[PDB]
Paper text:
CCL2 (Monocyte Chemoattractant Protein-1; MCP-1) is a member of the CC-chemokine family, a group of small secreted proteins of 8–10 kDa that regulate leukocyte migration in the human body. CCL2 acts as a strong chemoattractant primarily for monocytes, but also for memory T cells and natural killer cells. Whereas other chemokines are able to bind and activate several members of the chemokine receptor family, which all belong to the group of G protein-coupled receptors, CCL2 binds with high affinity almost exclusively to chemokine receptor 2 (CCR2)2. Spiegelmers are chemically synthesized L-stereoisomer oligonucleotide aptamers, which are biologically very stable and immunologically passive because of their non-natural mirror-image conformation.
Author numbering: 3 to 70
Write the structure that this text describes.
């Protein structure tokens, strides 16, 4: 269940863009406990990075990853 599940949020967004070749996947932050809308990219070396879904590169990267 989710009632007592911990919730993961984003507070800081990466300043710099990440090339598609370095991205393995993403997930969205849905929880209304979180301060703002966010995307977490997991890179090809499993590092997790907060990114702002308002930014266009973030949107396009998400679409690309969705396809493969
Ligand atoms: K300069
Ligand atoms: K220039
Ligand atoms: K191209
Ligand atoms: K212009
Ligand atoms: K494209
Ligand atoms: Na140059
Ligand atoms: Sr640039």
């Amino acid at each position: 269940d989710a009632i007592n599940a911990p919730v993961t949020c984003c507070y800081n967004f990466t300043n710099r863009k990440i090339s598609v070749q370095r991205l393995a996947s993403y997930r969205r932050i849905t929880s209304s406990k979180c301060p703002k809308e966010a995307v977490i990219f997991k890179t090809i070396v499993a590092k997790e990075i907060c990114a702002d879904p308002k930014q266009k590169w973030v949107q396009d990267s998400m679409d690309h990853l969705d396809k493969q």
